[PDB]
Amino acid sequence: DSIGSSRLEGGSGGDSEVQRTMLELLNQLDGFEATKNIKVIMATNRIDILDSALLRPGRIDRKIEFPPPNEEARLDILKIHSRKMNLTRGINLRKIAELMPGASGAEVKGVCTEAGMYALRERRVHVTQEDFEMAVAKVMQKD
Amino acid sequence: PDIQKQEVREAVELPLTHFELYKQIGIDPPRGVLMYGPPGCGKTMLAKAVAHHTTAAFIRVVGSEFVQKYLGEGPRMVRD
Amino acid sequence: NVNVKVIMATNRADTLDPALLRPGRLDRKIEFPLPDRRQKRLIFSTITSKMNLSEEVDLEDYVARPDKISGADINSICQESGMLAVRENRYIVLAKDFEKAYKTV
Amino acid sequence: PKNPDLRIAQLRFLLSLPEHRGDAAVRDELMAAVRDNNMAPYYEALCKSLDWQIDVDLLNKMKKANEDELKRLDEELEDAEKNLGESEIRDAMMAKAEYLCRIGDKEGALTAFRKTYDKTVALGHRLDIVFYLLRIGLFYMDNDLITRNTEKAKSLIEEGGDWDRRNRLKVYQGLYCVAIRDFKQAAELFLDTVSTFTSYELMDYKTFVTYTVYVSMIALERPDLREKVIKGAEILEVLHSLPAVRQYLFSLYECRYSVFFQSLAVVEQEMKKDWLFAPHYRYYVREMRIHAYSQLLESYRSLTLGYMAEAFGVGVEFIDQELSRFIAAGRLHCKIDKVNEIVETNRPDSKNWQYQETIKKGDLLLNRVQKLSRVINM
Amino acid sequence: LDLFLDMEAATGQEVELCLECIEWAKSEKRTFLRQALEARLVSLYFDTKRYQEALHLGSQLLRELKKMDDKALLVEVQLLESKTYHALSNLPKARAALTSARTTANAIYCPPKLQATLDMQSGIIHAAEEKDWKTAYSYFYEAFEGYDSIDSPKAITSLKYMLLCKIMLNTPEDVQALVSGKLALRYAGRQTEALKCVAQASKNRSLADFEKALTDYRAELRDDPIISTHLAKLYDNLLEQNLIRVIEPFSRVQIEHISSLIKLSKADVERKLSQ
Amino acid sequence: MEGCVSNLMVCNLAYSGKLEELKESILADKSLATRTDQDSRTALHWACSAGHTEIVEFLLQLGVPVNDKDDAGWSPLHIAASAGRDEIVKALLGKGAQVNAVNQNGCTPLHYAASKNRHEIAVMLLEGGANPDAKDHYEATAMHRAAAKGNLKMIHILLYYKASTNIQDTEGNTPLHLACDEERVEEAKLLVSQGASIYIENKEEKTPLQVAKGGLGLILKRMVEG
């Protein structure tokens, strides 16, 4: 799963090497099976989904829609992210989870990972709602 | 062995000379500065601009010197 | 708990890998495909601040025409104009050297 | 506490001994007696106060007010107790302990601050509690007790210096170094005066400057002054507060004892009648005198009695016994001879003496290797 | 208000009248008016040599000024802030306020009155620490260009500042070259004569004559600014030159004999020496 | 470094602002004012640049042509507008100088008048019968630069003459787009309330609503429908 940096000229072929690798791997799996419980799960944030659709013109695939920041899906994973880092009991996650729709769920993780740094810089042992709010503002400054 | 230079300024010289202010406003200073586009070059003009605006240690890159026959030198170099 | 500054440079925004652009790292993202009037005015202002300016030099045509046709390394072109002005033909650099440096490269 | 009642109760020193200032002192003591539950402190200080005629009147109201407020704090504590929360019980116990500092009960404050010490989620809040012990520690003027929690909280910080936290702590260090006679090691403490602001919790800014001006002017020599205060703009900004300080600095820097001895009375009167600065009023005078004498005798070898008497504007008979005492007891320079009726020194403290500076540590090392030889075989 | 303050009469009721003006402006709810009245008021306290309420109300003014529009108005009060901090002699805050004023006034074109005052003050700031006399001389030069022929006192004090900062580096030749000019000849007066005496005492390397310049002309030098400390610094500098000149070859010699040439008392001499 | 801005003596004298030596030069030789430098300019241009009224009034009294241009086509009126001097403009317009004169980029003096933010100069220039709807080689009016430098009063006095806001740049960017790019709320709301069409699309096919950020285009559309 790649958003960061590529040449897209020679890098497209560089990725095409890995695509060829998983291609021949799928050719081995389709060819025969030595043992069960063998699967592969990939991810793509870009047009390389359609490129994979070009490499796999409707042969073997499993399609699952993945909307960014769906909601109820934001809450539980926000709790999961709140398990590792220190968080008080007087904070409301609902509205701060509902404060960033229509964009993505990565903004939430950004808000969290930053809130850790915010709490460390403000010398706080815990994270508050105002921290999450300001973090939301900061991550919405870019978008 | 007007908005661009202001945003960059606030993303460079303001975090440099101001700490406790950022602690008061509760805002973490941005580390990165991003550029884009084929016509836009940058990478020089802005660096020299910051160099003239603020006086400090600046590190300019000659490209990648860490790619060699020895792969163990790189991590130690960037660590140094 | 440390003092450092790291800035990034990239040509395109579709640049693709799992390293640099991961959310939570870069707090500033600026797309700059086609430089506007204000940015040109400022970037010419900072370069006309140190170097000797002139009243005959117009910033209007240079804030206009490059908006249509945009080249790279503006400061380098200005330095080339400095190489045109190092010929000791004229004391104060004018729009002639700039336009010449623009049409040549 | 952080209330002005701390300073009001800190004025008890000048309220007690002198009978001259015992009017306004007991006046604003009685005036502030109705604030921040001052009943118990002035009840204990009642021996230095007036009769029981007007005293027992307010006691009946203050004692029931104290009980009501305390049982209300207990009620709030019970409301916070048996419930889910962290900062609630912390702030409740903290405020309760603050009121326990207001009444002046050290035991209740001790056990309360101990409980909230055990309830500390972080080292920062712990340091806040420590400071809460320090502010009342200034009133109780304890020594080892206030240094105990600070020495304990000294290690394992890792969060770095904050804005008003490290600053206030630095101020506390300045204060406990005002109490102790340590100077040279305390010379780094007042360098934070740039970031210091007005504080109503312990001491005012101008009062802090007024307190540190003594150690800065006396304990620090001219190179130290030029390196710190003269180069700095702080004293340049705060000299406009009072005309006295500027004159005291200029007269000493220009080595003029004429106006210095004239204004010396004001310095002496300002030196005494102070809470923590009282026992040291004997030391600073002698130290400043011997420092001035050493400074004047530094660049001067043979001194006539006339120019000296004109410079100091004082009799020769007094500086006679003065210097005579500063020979043996003072131990500053070499022997002075009056045979020529003119002061003439020698002071071979440079060449051979620089090499003779190690003979003391050498003899001590000799005794110490005699100790090392004493450990041998048994 | 300005025309009333230019008269300089009964300054006691002036401040109270200004307070009435501020109260009235607040009564009619005019922000810019009361801000201007306070901007003049802090100048009044600046002329009253009171650095407390001027800096306090000045700061309180800055707080509401930074939040609002018209950044050009901030340049004035920040300049006066640099002035009063120069009176309090504080380098970092005055330099920071100066830089802030520069980056504030960079976009907006300032009048020659305010613009030249920036460089004029900056020159004194750089002359305080005595880092580089050239840059300072440049600042006083541009300040002279801005203060040129607007008013007589401003011009004569401009050339006064020029001759001062240029005599800080002790070159009387350029002083003569400047006073030989016809342009500065019409701006000449009793002010530049003392400077000519200083330049003469510098080129002749005379002490007692410089003391005479500090004697007869002190009636004037009475209104002399804080630069008098720098003047005494130059005096003590030349004094140091003489002291390391005539004393050095003599290992041990009579003090009255070596002071016979300088024909001055040995008191201040012994004081400075021992110092 | 600094020095003479031109090789000619009369030009440097006009730039230095010496009245007596210049008058003496003219009285000595009348052909000195007709001379041309390497910059193809005369003493009149440097005199208008210096901001001296007496000199330019004397020259205009002598009857020197105001239509004289350099290699870059700069007119004395452009220099006068760029200098920010009212009296010079009064003199030039008083002598009947052409306001339709164009420079290398074809920018009218109104552009430089709005660039230096001079209200009086702009008003006096537009009073002489000048056309606010005139376009340069880049096909842009003074309203563009006025909205770019964030001048409300300039656009206001430009609208006092009922100048059309429907002028389209060759790039496709209307003054409203520049008003949104400058993030000026007052200017945007004003221009929109004046009947400016928001349906004009550029070469990038970007509506003015998408140009502004922070929901400014929303309240702009609110002002349109309202």
Curated annotation (Swiss-Prot), chain A:
Region (May mediate interaction with PRPF9) residue spans: 1-143
SS bonds (residue pairs): none
Location(s) in or outside the cell: Cytoplasm; Nucleus
Record function comment: Component of the 26S proteasome, a multiprotein complex involved in the ATP-dependent degradation of ubiquitinated proteins. This complex plays a key role in the maintenance of protein homeostasis by removing misfolded or damaged proteins, which could impair cellular functions, and by removing proteins whose functions are no longer required. Therefore, the proteasome participates in numerous cellular processes, including cell cycle progression, apoptosis, or DNA damage repair.
Family from the record: Belongs to the AAA ATPase family.
Subunit annotation: Component of the 19S proteasome regulatory particle complex. The 26S proteasome consists of a 20S core particle (CP) and two 19S regulatory subunits (RP). The regulatory particle is made of a lid composed of 9 subunits, a base containing 6 ATPases including PSMC5 and few additional components. Component of a complex with USP49 and RUVBL1. Interacts with PRPF19. Interacts with TRIM5. Interacts with NDC80. Interacts with PAAF1. Interacts, in vitro, with the thyroid hormone receptor (in a thyroid hormone T3-dependent manner) and with retinoid X receptor (RXR). Interacts with ERCC6.
Protein's UniProt name: 26S proteasome regulatory subunit 8
Taxonomic lineage from the root: Eukaryota, Metazoa, Chordata, Craniata, Vertebrata
Swiss-Prot record, chain C:
N6-acetyllysine modified-residue sites: 96, 100
Location in or out of the cell: Cytoplasm; Nucleus
Physiological role: Component of the 26S proteasome, a multiprotein complex involved in the ATP-dependent degradation of ubiquitinated proteins. This complex plays a key role in the maintenance of protein homeostasis by removing misfolded or damaged proteins, which could impair cellular functions, and by removing proteins whose functions are no longer required. Therefore, the proteasome participates in numerous cellular processes, including cell cycle progression, apoptosis, or DNA damage repair.
Family: Belongs to the AAA ATPase family.
Subunit structure: Component of the 19S proteasome regulatory particle complex. The 26S proteasome consists of a 20S core particle (CP) and two 19S regulatory subunits (RP). The regulatory particle is made of a lid composed of 9 subunits, a base containing 6 ATPases including PSMC4 and few additional components. Interacts with NR1I3. Interacts with PAAF1. Interacts with TRIM5. Interacts with ZFAND1.
Name by which UniProt lists this protein: 26S proteasome regulatory subunit 6B
Residues of the full protein shown: 302 to 406 of 418
UniProtKB/Swiss-Prot annotation, chain D:
Swiss-Prot/TrEMBL keywords: Proteasome
PROSITE patterns, per database record: PCI
SUPFAM superfamilies reported in the protein's UniProt record: TPR-like, Winged helix' DNA-binding domain
Span of domain PCI: 182-350
A GO CC term assigned to this protein in UniProt: secretory granule lumen
SMART domains named among the record's database cross-references: PINT
InterPro entries: PCI_dom (IPR000717), Rpn7/CSN1 (IPR019585), Rpn7_N (IPR045135), RPN7_PSMD6_C (IPR049549), TPR-like_helical_dom_sf (IPR011990), WH_DNA-bd_sf (IPR036390)
Domain of life: Eukaryota
GO biological process: proteasome-mediated ubiquitin-dependent protein catabolic process
Similarity section: Belongs to the proteasome subunit S10 family.
Function, as annotated: Component of the 26S proteasome, a multiprotein complex involved in the ATP-dependent degradation of ubiquitinated proteins. This complex plays a key role in the maintenance of protein homeostasis by removing misfolded or damaged proteins, which could impair cellular functions, and by removing proteins whose functions are no longer required. Therefore, the proteasome participates in numerous cellular processes, including cell cycle progression, apoptosis, or DNA damage repair.
Assembly with partners or alone: Component of the 19S proteasome regulatory particle complex. The 26S proteasome consists of a 20S core particle (CP) and two 19S regulatory subunits (RP). The regulatory particle is made of a lid composed of 9 subunits including PSMD6, a base containing 6 ATPases and few additional components.
PANTHER family: 26S PROTEASOME NON-ATPASE REGULATORY SUBUNIT 6, 26S PROTESOME SUBUNIT 6
From Swiss-Prot, chain E:
GO CC, one annotated term: membrane
Compartments where located: Nucleus; Cytoplasm, Cytosol
PCI domain residues: 132-275
GO process annotations (BP): proteasome assembly; proteasome-mediated ubiquitin-dependent protein catabolic process; stem cell differentiation; ubiquitin-dependent protein catabolic process
Tissue expression notes: Highly expressed in embryonic stem cells (ESCs). Expression decreases as ESCs differentiate.
Parts of the chain that traverse the membrane: none
Chief subcellular location: nucleus
GO molecular function: structural molecule activity
Entry keyword Ubl conjugation: yes
UniProt key word Cytoplasm: yes
Induction conditions: By FOXO4; expression in embryonic stem cells (ESCs) is mediated by FOXO4.
Placement of covalent cross-link Glycyl lysine isopeptide (Lys-Gly) (interchain with G-Cter in SUMO2): 182
Quaternary structure, from the entry: Component of the 19S proteasome regulatory particle complex. The 26S proteasome consists of a 20S core particle (CP) and two 19S regulatory subunits (RP). The regulatory particle is made of a lid composed of 9 subunits including PSMD11, a base containing 6 ATPases and few additional components.
Protein name according to UniProt: 26S proteasome non-ATPase regulatory subunit 11
